[PDB]
Amino acid sequence: PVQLNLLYVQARDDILNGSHPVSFDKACEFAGYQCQIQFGPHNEQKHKPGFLELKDFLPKEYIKQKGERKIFMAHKNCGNMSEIEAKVRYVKLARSLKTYGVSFFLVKEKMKGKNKLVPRLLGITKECVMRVDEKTKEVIQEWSLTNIKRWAASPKSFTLDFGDYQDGYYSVQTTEGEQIAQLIAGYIDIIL
Amino acid sequence: MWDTANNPLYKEA
């Protein structure tokens, strides 16, 4: 019990505070299990819109949306599923998503033909660097940490040079340039 | 402003 719960709490919080970017629909799937866990099977009597504080069931970037109807619907989808069997599922849904176990940063990429930068999620692990869609969350690109030649940072930018001719560099708008530079560095020197 | 990985793919090894 105690071990299963450490992981559940870990996965949960990393989602509620937005450390693990997930797409709406899933946040509500999670919330669904979160209700099964904290309340027990659904009760179409008590469990109706307004019966929940959505600030402690979802990523700040969805509390607004008001998908309280989505959560109870997913809640309902758990029948009489145990508090434990739900914790499990939630932890398997948390791992099945690529964004799982990555350390993102919000970056602003300049896309050709449009002066208007398009917010993006930058992901980094001890093995790769991925490009993740701000809203949808679906990765768009992926690079091996071992193909990183050098990086650079400034109080308002970050750039990664793989040494890939055609593509060139990957520069972005960021205030976290010195932290994203620190991470990678730590990782790289662990991986020869 | 560069910080290289001194990665064997590039650095002369």
mmCIF file of N, CA and C in Angstrom, chain A residues 8-138:
data_model
loop_
_atom_site.group_PDB
_atom_site.id
_atom_site.type_symbol
_atom_site.label_atom_id
_atom_site.label_comp_id
_atom_site.label_asym_id
_atom_site.label_seq_id
_atom_site.Cartn_x
_atom_site.Cartn_y
_atom_site.Cartn_z
ATOM 1 N N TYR A 8 1.799 6.952 -6.840
ATOM 2 C CA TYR A 8 0.586 7.646 -7.219
ATOM 3 C C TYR A 8 0.698 9.124 -6.844
ATOM 4 N N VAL A 9 1.083 9.392 -5.594
ATOM 5 C CA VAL A 9 1.207 10.772 -5.127
ATOM 6 C C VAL A 9 2.202 11.492 -6.009
ATOM 7 N N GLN A 10 3.321 10.835 -6.291
ATOM 8 C CA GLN A 10 4.337 11.434 -7.148
ATOM 9 C C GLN A 10 3.773 11.785 -8.528
ATOM 10 N N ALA A 11 3.180 10.810 -9.215
ATOM 11 C CA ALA A 11 2.622 11.056 -10.542
ATOM 12 C C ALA A 11 1.558 12.142 -10.500
ATOM 13 N N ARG A 12 0.662 12.044 -9.522
ATOM 14 C CA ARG A 12 -0.406 13.022 -9.372
ATOM 15 C C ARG A 12 0.149 14.431 -9.306
ATOM 16 N N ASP A 13 0.825 14.743 -8.212
ATOM 17 C CA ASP A 13 1.383 16.071 -8.038
ATOM 18 C C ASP A 13 2.174 16.591 -9.239
ATOM 19 N N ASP A 14 2.997 15.748 -9.842
ATOM 20 C CA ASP A 14 3.757 16.216 -10.979
ATOM 21 C C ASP A 14 2.811 16.592 -12.104
ATOM 22 N N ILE A 15 1.533 16.274 -11.948
ATOM 23 C CA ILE A 15 0.572 16.628 -12.985
ATOM 24 C C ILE A 15 -0.262 17.831 -12.547
ATOM 25 N N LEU A 16 -0.613 17.856 -11.274
ATOM 26 C CA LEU A 16 -1.391 18.947 -10.747
ATOM 27 C C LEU A 16 -0.632 20.271 -10.746
ATOM 28 N N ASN A 17 0.678 20.235 -10.505
ATOM 29 C CA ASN A 17 1.459 21.474 -10.516
ATOM 30 C C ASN A 17 2.024 21.757 -11.913
ATOM 31 N N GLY A 18 1.568 20.982 -12.900
ATOM 32 C CA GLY A 18 2.013 21.160 -14.270
ATOM 33 C C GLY A 18 3.424 20.720 -14.649
ATOM 34 N N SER A 19 4.120 19.952 -13.802
ATOM 35 C CA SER A 19 5.470 19.489 -14.140
ATOM 36 C C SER A 19 5.372 18.444 -15.248
ATOM 37 N N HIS A 20 4.239 17.769 -15.307
ATOM 38 C CA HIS A 20 4.042 16.788 -16.347
ATOM 39 C C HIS A 20 2.928 17.289 -17.233
ATOM 40 N N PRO A 21 3.308 17.869 -18.359
ATOM 41 C CA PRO A 21 2.292 18.379 -19.261
ATOM 42 C C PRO A 21 1.428 17.270 -19.841
ATOM 43 N N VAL A 22 0.120 17.413 -19.669
ATOM 44 C CA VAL A 22 -0.819 16.446 -20.206
ATOM 45 C C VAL A 22 -1.928 17.235 -20.880
ATOM 46 N N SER A 23 -2.555 16.618 -21.874
ATOM 47 C CA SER A 23 -3.629 17.250 -22.617
ATOM 48 C C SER A 23 -4.947 17.121 -21.879
ATOM 49 N N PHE A 24 -5.687 18.222 -21.830
ATOM 50 C CA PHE A 24 -6.997 18.306 -21.186
ATOM 51 C C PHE A 24 -7.642 16.945 -20.904
ATOM 52 N N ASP A 25 -8.257 16.401 -21.943
ATOM 53 C CA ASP A 25 -8.926 15.118 -21.875
ATOM 54 C C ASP A 25 -8.292 14.114 -20.916
ATOM 55 N N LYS A 26 -6.966 14.038 -20.896
ATOM 56 C CA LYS A 26 -6.302 13.105 -19.985
ATOM 57 C C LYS A 26 -6.370 13.653 -18.549
ATOM 58 N N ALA A 27 -6.137 14.952 -18.381
ATOM 59 C CA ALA A 27 -6.177 15.562 -17.049
ATOM 60 C C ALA A 27 -7.468 15.155 -16.352
ATOM 61 N N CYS A 28 -8.525 15.081 -17.146
ATOM 62 C CA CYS A 28 -9.834 14.725 -16.647
ATOM 63 C C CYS A 28 -9.959 13.225 -16.451
ATOM 64 N N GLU A 29 -9.103 12.469 -17.118
ATOM 65 C CA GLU A 29 -9.136 11.019 -16.992
ATOM 66 C C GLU A 29 -8.480 10.752 -15.661
ATOM 67 N N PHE A 30 -7.403 11.482 -15.426
ATOM 68 C CA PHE A 30 -6.654 11.384 -14.194
ATOM 69 C C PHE A 30 -7.589 11.809 -13.099
ATOM 70 N N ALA A 31 -8.141 13.007 -13.237
ATOM 71 C CA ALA A 31 -9.052 13.516 -12.232
ATOM 72 C C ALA A 31 -10.108 12.457 -11.945
ATOM 73 N N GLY A 32 -10.518 11.744 -12.983
ATOM 74 C CA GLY A 32 -11.507 10.706 -12.811
ATOM 75 C C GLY A 32 -11.029 9.707 -11.780
ATOM 76 N N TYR A 33 -9.816 9.187 -11.950
ATOM 77 C CA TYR A 33 -9.283 8.231 -10.985
ATOM 78 C C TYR A 33 -9.067 8.929 -9.658
ATOM 79 N N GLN A 34 -8.712 10.211 -9.705
ATOM 80 C CA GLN A 34 -8.451 10.948 -8.471
ATOM 81 C C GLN A 34 -9.703 11.021 -7.623
ATOM 82 N N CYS A 35 -10.852 10.982 -8.278
ATOM 83 C CA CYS A 35 -12.112 11.028 -7.568
ATOM 84 C C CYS A 35 -12.412 9.634 -7.028
ATOM 85 N N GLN A 36 -12.213 8.627 -7.862
ATOM 86 C CA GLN A 36 -12.462 7.274 -7.430
ATOM 87 C C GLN A 36 -11.618 7.024 -6.185
ATOM 88 N N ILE A 37 -10.397 7.536 -6.183
ATOM 89 C CA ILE A 37 -9.502 7.334 -5.051
ATOM 90 C C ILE A 37 -9.949 8.068 -3.793
ATOM 91 N N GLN A 38 -10.185 9.371 -3.916
ATOM 92 C CA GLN A 38 -10.578 10.200 -2.773
ATOM 93 C C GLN A 38 -12.033 10.104 -2.302
ATOM 94 N N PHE A 39 -12.935 9.644 -3.165
ATOM 95 C CA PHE A 39 -14.348 9.560 -2.792
ATOM 96 C C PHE A 39 -14.929 8.154 -2.733
ATOM 97 N N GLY A 40 -14.441 7.268 -3.600
ATOM 98 C CA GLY A 40 -14.957 5.913 -3.655
ATOM 99 C C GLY A 40 -15.813 5.839 -4.898
ATOM 100 N N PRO A 41 -16.556 4.754 -5.135
ATOM 101 C CA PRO A 41 -17.349 4.775 -6.368
ATOM 102 C C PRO A 41 -18.150 6.068 -6.489
ATOM 103 N N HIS A 42 -18.581 6.362 -7.712
ATOM 104 C CA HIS A 42 -19.337 7.573 -8.005
ATOM 105 C C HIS A 42 -20.707 7.526 -7.369
ATOM 106 N N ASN A 43 -21.248 8.710 -7.101
ATOM 107 C CA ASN A 43 -22.572 8.856 -6.504
ATOM 108 C C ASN A 43 -23.258 10.012 -7.239
ATOM 109 N N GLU A 44 -23.933 9.679 -8.341
ATOM 110 C CA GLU A 44 -24.626 10.664 -9.166
ATOM 111 C C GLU A 44 -25.524 11.599 -8.374
ATOM 112 N N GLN A 45 -25.532 11.438 -7.057
ATOM 113 C CA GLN A 45 -26.324 12.299 -6.205
ATOM 114 C C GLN A 45 -25.437 13.439 -5.754
ATOM 115 N N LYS A 46 -24.402 13.096 -4.989
ATOM 116 C CA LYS A 46 -23.457 14.080 -4.460
ATOM 117 C C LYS A 46 -22.521 14.657 -5.529
ATOM 118 N N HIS A 47 -21.892 13.754 -6.271
ATOM 119 C CA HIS A 47 -20.923 14.083 -7.313
ATOM 120 C C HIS A 47 -21.471 14.725 -8.594
ATOM 121 N N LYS A 48 -21.813 16.011 -8.479
ATOM 122 C CA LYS A 48 -22.329 16.830 -9.576
ATOM 123 C C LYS A 48 -21.550 18.140 -9.563
ATOM 124 N N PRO A 49 -21.419 18.807 -10.730
ATOM 125 C CA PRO A 49 -20.690 20.076 -10.898
ATOM 126 C C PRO A 49 -20.804 21.040 -9.721
ATOM 127 N N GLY A 50 -19.663 21.547 -9.272
ATOM 128 C CA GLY A 50 -19.651 22.460 -8.144
ATOM 129 C C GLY A 50 -19.255 21.719 -6.881
ATOM 130 N N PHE A 51 -19.430 20.396 -6.889
ATOM 131 C CA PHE A 51 -19.090 19.569 -5.734
ATOM 132 C C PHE A 51 -17.579 19.420 -5.615
ATOM 133 N N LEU A 52 -16.857 19.970 -6.574
ATOM 134 C CA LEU A 52 -15.412 19.849 -6.556
ATOM 135 C C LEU A 52 -14.640 21.146 -6.645
ATOM 136 N N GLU A 53 -13.487 21.151 -6.004
ATOM 137 C CA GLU A 53 -12.609 22.289 -6.096
ATOM 138 C C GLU A 53 -11.716 21.815 -7.243
ATOM 139 N N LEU A 54 -11.758 22.515 -8.371
ATOM 140 C CA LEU A 54 -10.975 22.115 -9.533
ATOM 141 C C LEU A 54 -9.524 22.572 -9.488
ATOM 142 N N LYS A 55 -9.149 23.282 -8.434
ATOM 143 C CA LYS A 55 -7.780 23.752 -8.304
ATOM 144 C C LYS A 55 -6.946 22.668 -7.665
ATOM 145 N N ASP A 56 -7.602 21.644 -7.140
ATOM 146 C CA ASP A 56 -6.875 20.553 -6.517
ATOM 147 C C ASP A 56 -7.225 19.237 -7.193
ATOM 148 N N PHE A 57 -7.503 19.328 -8.498
ATOM 149 C CA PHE A 57 -7.834 18.181 -9.341
ATOM 150 C C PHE A 57 -7.333 18.344 -10.759
ATOM 151 N N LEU A 58 -6.801 19.518 -11.066
ATOM 152 C CA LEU A 58 -6.334 19.775 -12.418
ATOM 153 C C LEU A 58 -5.177 20.753 -12.535
ATOM 154 N N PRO A 59 -4.554 20.772 -13.717
ATOM 155 C CA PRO A 59 -3.429 21.645 -14.050
ATOM 156 C C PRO A 59 -3.978 23.061 -14.172
ATOM 157 N N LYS A 60 -3.394 23.981 -13.416
ATOM 158 C CA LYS A 60 -3.823 25.368 -13.436
ATOM 159 C C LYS A 60 -4.373 25.774 -14.803
ATOM 160 N N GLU A 61 -3.759 25.271 -15.874
ATOM 161 C CA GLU A 61 -4.176 25.610 -17.240
ATOM 162 C C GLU A 61 -5.389 24.848 -17.749
ATOM 163 N N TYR A 62 -6.337 24.553 -16.869
ATOM 164 C CA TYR A 62 -7.548 23.827 -17.263
ATOM 165 C C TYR A 62 -8.673 24.102 -16.274
ATOM 166 N N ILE A 63 -8.300 24.500 -15.058
ATOM 167 C CA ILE A 63 -9.281 24.798 -14.022
ATOM 168 C C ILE A 63 -10.294 25.746 -14.634
ATOM 169 N N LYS A 64 -9.795 26.643 -15.473
ATOM 170 C CA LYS A 64 -10.643 27.597 -16.166
ATOM 171 C C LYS A 64 -11.647 26.835 -17.036
ATOM 172 N N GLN A 65 -11.136 26.153 -18.059
ATOM 173 C CA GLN A 65 -11.983 25.400 -18.977
ATOM 174 C C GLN A 65 -13.278 24.888 -18.345
ATOM 175 N N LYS A 66 -13.209 24.441 -17.097
ATOM 176 C CA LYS A 66 -14.393 23.911 -16.433
ATOM 177 C C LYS A 66 -14.850 22.640 -17.142
ATOM 178 N N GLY A 67 -14.112 21.556 -16.914
ATOM 179 C CA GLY A 67 -14.451 20.278 -17.507
ATOM 180 C C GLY A 67 -14.937 19.379 -16.393
ATOM 181 N N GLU A 68 -15.459 20.002 -15.338
ATOM 182 C CA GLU A 68 -15.967 19.281 -14.178
ATOM 183 C C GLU A 68 -16.932 18.186 -14.584
ATOM 184 N N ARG A 69 -17.542 18.340 -15.755
ATOM 185 C CA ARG A 69 -18.476 17.344 -16.258
ATOM 186 C C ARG A 69 -17.683 16.191 -16.876
ATOM 187 N N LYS A 70 -16.467 16.479 -17.319
ATOM 188 C CA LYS A 70 -15.633 15.438 -17.899
ATOM 189 C C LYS A 70 -15.081 14.530 -16.803
ATOM 190 N N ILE A 71 -14.718 15.129 -15.672
ATOM 191 C CA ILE A 71 -14.150 14.381 -14.561
ATOM 192 C C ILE A 71 -15.136 13.414 -13.915
ATOM 193 N N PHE A 72 -16.356 13.877 -13.709
ATOM 194 C CA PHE A 72 -17.351 13.012 -13.113
ATOM 195 C C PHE A 72 -17.727 11.922 -14.102
ATOM 196 N N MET A 73 -17.685 12.239 -15.393
ATOM 197 C CA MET A 73 -18.037 11.237 -16.387
ATOM 198 C C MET A 73 -17.000 10.137 -16.356
ATOM 199 N N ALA A 74 -15.733 10.520 -16.185
ATOM 200 C CA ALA A 74 -14.634 9.551 -16.103
ATOM 201 C C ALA A 74 -14.695 8.886 -14.735
ATOM 202 N N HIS A 75 -15.160 9.644 -13.752
ATOM 203 C CA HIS A 75 -15.289 9.138 -12.405
ATOM 204 C C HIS A 75 -16.253 7.982 -12.454
ATOM 205 N N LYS A 76 -17.395 8.257 -13.062
ATOM 206 C CA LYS A 76 -18.461 7.286 -13.230
ATOM 207 C C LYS A 76 -17.917 6.030 -13.905
ATOM 208 N N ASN A 77 -16.983 6.209 -14.841
ATOM 209 C CA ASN A 77 -16.372 5.093 -15.576
ATOM 210 C C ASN A 77 -15.500 4.151 -14.741
ATOM 211 N N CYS A 78 -15.491 4.352 -13.432
ATOM 212 C CA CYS A 78 -14.680 3.511 -12.578
ATOM 213 C C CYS A 78 -15.535 2.559 -11.767
ATOM 214 N N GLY A 79 -16.831 2.548 -12.061
ATOM 215 C CA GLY A 79 -17.739 1.671 -11.345
ATOM 216 C C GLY A 79 -17.403 1.603 -9.871
ATOM 217 N N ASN A 80 -17.150 0.393 -9.381
ATOM 218 C CA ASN A 80 -16.804 0.180 -7.977
ATOM 219 C C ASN A 80 -15.325 -0.169 -7.828
ATOM 220 N N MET A 81 -14.518 0.311 -8.765
ATOM 221 C CA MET A 81 -13.083 0.056 -8.771
ATOM 222 C C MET A 81 -12.430 0.508 -7.459
ATOM 223 N N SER A 82 -11.565 -0.340 -6.913
ATOM 224 C CA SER A 82 -10.886 -0.047 -5.656
ATOM 225 C C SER A 82 -9.994 1.188 -5.682
ATOM 226 N N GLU A 83 -9.745 1.706 -4.482
ATOM 227 C CA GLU A 83 -8.917 2.876 -4.220
ATOM 228 C C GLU A 83 -7.494 2.545 -4.653
ATOM 229 N N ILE A 84 -7.154 1.269 -4.550
ATOM 230 C CA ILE A 84 -5.841 0.775 -4.921
ATOM 231 C C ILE A 84 -5.731 0.492 -6.424
ATOM 232 N N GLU A 85 -6.752 -0.160 -6.984
ATOM 233 C CA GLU A 85 -6.749 -0.500 -8.407
ATOM 234 C C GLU A 85 -6.859 0.728 -9.286
ATOM 235 N N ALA A 86 -7.241 1.847 -8.673
ATOM 236 C CA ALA A 86 -7.361 3.118 -9.376
ATOM 237 C C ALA A 86 -5.987 3.797 -9.327
ATOM 238 N N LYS A 87 -5.331 3.719 -8.171
ATOM 239 C CA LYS A 87 -4.017 4.317 -8.001
ATOM 240 C C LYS A 87 -3.114 3.716 -9.052
ATOM 241 N N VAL A 88 -3.246 2.403 -9.240
ATOM 242 C CA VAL A 88 -2.463 1.657 -10.223
ATOM 243 C C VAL A 88 -2.665 2.207 -11.627
ATOM 244 N N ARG A 89 -3.912 2.191 -12.073
ATOM 245 C CA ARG A 89 -4.262 2.673 -13.397
ATOM 246 C C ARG A 89 -3.717 4.059 -13.667
ATOM 247 N N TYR A 90 -3.892 4.942 -12.693
ATOM 248 C CA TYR A 90 -3.456 6.331 -12.791
ATOM 249 C C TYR A 90 -1.947 6.428 -13.040
ATOM 250 N N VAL A 91 -1.204 5.526 -12.404
ATOM 251 C CA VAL A 91 0.247 5.461 -12.511
ATOM 252 C C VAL A 91 0.665 4.809 -13.823
ATOM 253 N N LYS A 92 -0.217 4.016 -14.413
ATOM 254 C CA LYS A 92 0.100 3.391 -15.688
ATOM 255 C C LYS A 92 -0.262 4.361 -16.819
ATOM 256 N N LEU A 93 -1.242 5.226 -16.565
ATOM 257 C CA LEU A 93 -1.657 6.219 -17.551
ATOM 258 C C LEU A 93 -0.622 7.332 -17.524
ATOM 259 N N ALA A 94 -0.041 7.574 -16.352
ATOM 260 C CA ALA A 94 0.980 8.605 -16.203
ATOM 261 C C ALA A 94 2.284 8.223 -16.908
ATOM 262 N N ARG A 95 2.570 6.925 -16.971
ATOM 263 C CA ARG A 95 3.796 6.426 -17.599
ATOM 264 C C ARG A 95 3.676 6.187 -19.102
ATOM 265 N N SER A 96 2.465 5.871 -19.553
ATOM 266 C CA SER A 96 2.200 5.601 -20.960
ATOM 267 C C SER A 96 2.334 6.822 -21.869
ATOM 268 N N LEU A 97 2.391 8.008 -21.276
ATOM 269 C CA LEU A 97 2.508 9.245 -22.028
ATOM 270 C C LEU A 97 3.986 9.620 -22.178
ATOM 271 N N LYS A 98 4.422 9.868 -23.413
ATOM 272 C CA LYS A 98 5.811 10.249 -23.701
ATOM 273 C C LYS A 98 6.355 11.364 -22.790
ATOM 274 N N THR A 99 5.542 12.385 -22.514
ATOM 275 C CA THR A 99 5.947 13.516 -21.675
ATOM 276 C C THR A 99 6.374 13.050 -20.298
ATOM 277 N N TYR A 100 6.146 11.764 -20.023
ATOM 278 C CA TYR A 100 6.492 11.171 -18.730
ATOM 279 C C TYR A 100 7.989 11.126 -18.408
ATOM 280 N N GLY A 101 8.360 11.745 -17.295
ATOM 281 C CA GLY A 101 9.746 11.740 -16.871
ATOM 282 C C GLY A 101 10.662 12.723 -17.565
ATOM 283 N N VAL A 102 10.086 13.749 -18.178
ATOM 284 C CA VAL A 102 10.875 14.758 -18.870
ATOM 285 C C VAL A 102 10.804 16.093 -18.124
ATOM 286 N N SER A 103 11.817 16.931 -18.320
ATOM 287 C CA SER A 103 11.884 18.223 -17.649
ATOM 288 C C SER A 103 11.721 19.338 -18.654
ATOM 289 N N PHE A 104 10.479 19.772 -18.813
ATOM 290 C CA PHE A 104 10.149 20.806 -19.766
ATOM 291 C C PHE A 104 10.423 22.237 -19.339
ATOM 292 N N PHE A 105 10.339 23.125 -20.322
ATOM 293 C CA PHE A 105 10.523 24.561 -20.146
ATOM 294 C C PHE A 105 9.674 25.188 -21.249
ATOM 295 N N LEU A 106 9.061 26.323 -20.963
ATOM 296 C CA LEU A 106 8.245 26.979 -21.965
ATOM 297 C C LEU A 106 9.171 27.854 -22.813
ATOM 298 N N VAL A 107 9.233 27.571 -24.108
ATOM 299 C CA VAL A 107 10.095 28.330 -25.002
ATOM 300 C C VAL A 107 9.297 28.909 -26.161
ATOM 301 N N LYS A 108 9.803 29.977 -26.762
ATOM 302 C CA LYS A 108 9.098 30.605 -27.862
ATOM 303 C C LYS A 108 9.909 30.501 -29.136
ATOM 304 N N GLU A 109 9.480 29.618 -30.028
ATOM 305 C CA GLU A 109 10.162 29.403 -31.293
ATOM 306 C C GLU A 109 9.684 30.302 -32.417
ATOM 307 N N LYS A 110 10.633 30.834 -33.176
ATOM 308 C CA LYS A 110 10.311 31.685 -34.310
ATOM 309 C C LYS A 110 10.120 30.782 -35.516
ATOM 310 N N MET A 111 8.888 30.721 -36.022
ATOM 311 C CA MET A 111 8.591 29.902 -37.195
ATOM 312 C C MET A 111 8.613 30.825 -38.398
ATOM 313 N N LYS A 112 9.277 30.385 -39.463
ATOM 314 C CA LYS A 112 9.403 31.178 -40.681
ATOM 315 C C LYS A 112 8.084 31.741 -41.174
ATOM 316 N N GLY A 113 8.161 32.871 -41.867
ATOM 317 C CA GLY A 113 6.976 33.510 -42.415
ATOM 318 C C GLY A 113 5.973 34.112 -41.444
ATOM 319 N N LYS A 114 6.283 34.101 -40.150
ATOM 320 C CA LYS A 114 5.371 34.649 -39.152
ATOM 321 C C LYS A 114 6.144 35.212 -37.982
ATOM 322 N N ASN A 115 6.234 36.533 -37.929
ATOM 323 C CA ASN A 115 6.957 37.200 -36.861
ATOM 324 C C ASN A 115 6.465 36.787 -35.481
ATOM 325 N N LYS A 116 5.228 36.302 -35.414
ATOM 326 C CA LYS A 116 4.659 35.915 -34.134
ATOM 327 C C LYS A 116 5.117 34.552 -33.646
ATOM 328 N N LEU A 117 6.003 34.588 -32.660
ATOM 329 C CA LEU A 117 6.559 33.401 -32.028
ATOM 330 C C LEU A 117 5.439 32.463 -31.591
ATOM 331 N N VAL A 118 5.688 31.157 -31.655
ATOM 332 C CA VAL A 118 4.679 30.182 -31.248
ATOM 333 C C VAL A 118 5.123 29.396 -30.015
ATOM 334 N N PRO A 119 4.566 29.731 -28.837
ATOM 335 C CA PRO A 119 4.914 29.042 -27.596
ATOM 336 C C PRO A 119 5.077 27.532 -27.800
ATOM 337 N N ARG A 120 6.106 26.967 -27.168
ATOM 338 C CA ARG A 120 6.412 25.547 -27.280
ATOM 339 C C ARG A 120 6.986 24.977 -25.996
ATOM 340 N N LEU A 121 6.846 23.667 -25.835
ATOM 341 C CA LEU A 121 7.364 22.987 -24.653
ATOM 342 C C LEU A 121 8.671 22.277 -25.030
ATOM 343 N N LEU A 122 9.739 22.579 -24.298
ATOM 344 C CA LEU A 122 11.040 21.968 -24.554
ATOM 345 C C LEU A 122 11.310 20.874 -23.530
ATOM 346 N N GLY A 123 11.563 19.658 -24.003
ATOM 347 C CA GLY A 123 11.800 18.555 -23.088
ATOM 348 C C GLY A 123 13.218 18.022 -23.096
ATOM 349 N N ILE A 124 13.736 17.706 -21.916
ATOM 350 C CA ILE A 124 15.093 17.198 -21.785
ATOM 351 C C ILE A 124 15.186 16.052 -20.771
ATOM 352 N N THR A 125 15.913 15.005 -21.150
ATOM 353 C CA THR A 125 16.129 13.841 -20.300
ATOM 354 C C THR A 125 17.606 13.505 -20.426
ATOM 355 N N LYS A 126 18.059 12.509 -19.682
ATOM 356 C CA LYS A 126 19.458 12.135 -19.739
ATOM 357 C C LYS A 126 19.801 11.510 -21.079
ATOM 358 N N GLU A 127 18.813 11.353 -21.951
ATOM 359 C CA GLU A 127 19.071 10.715 -23.228
ATOM 360 C C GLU A 127 18.605 11.434 -24.477
ATOM 361 N N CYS A 128 17.691 12.385 -24.335
ATOM 362 C CA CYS A 128 17.195 13.052 -25.526
ATOM 363 C C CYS A 128 16.638 14.441 -25.272
ATOM 364 N N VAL A 129 16.392 15.158 -26.364
ATOM 365 C CA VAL A 129 15.816 16.484 -26.314
ATOM 366 C C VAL A 129 14.666 16.463 -27.305
ATOM 367 N N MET A 130 13.455 16.704 -26.810
ATOM 368 C CA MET A 130 12.261 16.693 -27.651
ATOM 369 C C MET A 130 11.542 18.043 -27.736
ATOM 370 N N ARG A 131 10.790 18.217 -28.816
ATOM 371 C CA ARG A 131 10.016 19.431 -29.056
ATOM 372 C C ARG A 131 8.576 19.034 -28.825
ATOM 373 N N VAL A 132 7.929 19.699 -27.873
ATOM 374 C CA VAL A 132 6.550 19.372 -27.530
ATOM 375 C C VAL A 132 5.554 20.526 -27.654
ATOM 376 N N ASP A 133 4.456 20.229 -28.344
ATOM 377 C CA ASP A 133 3.354 21.147 -28.631
ATOM 378 C C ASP A 133 2.676 21.754 -27.388
ATOM 379 N N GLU A 134 2.844 23.063 -27.214
ATOM 380 C CA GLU A 134 2.282 23.813 -26.080
ATOM 381 C C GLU A 134 0.932 23.302 -25.566
ATOM 382 N N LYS A 135 -0.068 23.281 -26.445
ATOM 383 C CA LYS A 135 -1.423 22.864 -26.078
ATOM 384 C C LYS A 135 -1.718 21.365 -26.229
ATOM 385 N N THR A 136 -1.536 20.818 -27.430
ATOM 386 C CA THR A 136 -1.806 19.402 -27.670
ATOM 387 C C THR A 136 -0.869 18.462 -26.895
ATOM 388 N N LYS A 137 0.373 18.893 -26.670
ATOM 389 C CA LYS A 137 1.368 18.100 -25.938
ATOM 390 C C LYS A 137 2.039 17.002 -26.755
ATOM 391 N N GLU A 138 1.588 16.792 -27.987
ATOM 392 C CA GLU A 138 2.164 15.751 -28.836
ATOM 393 C C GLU A 138 3.551 16.168 -29.289
#
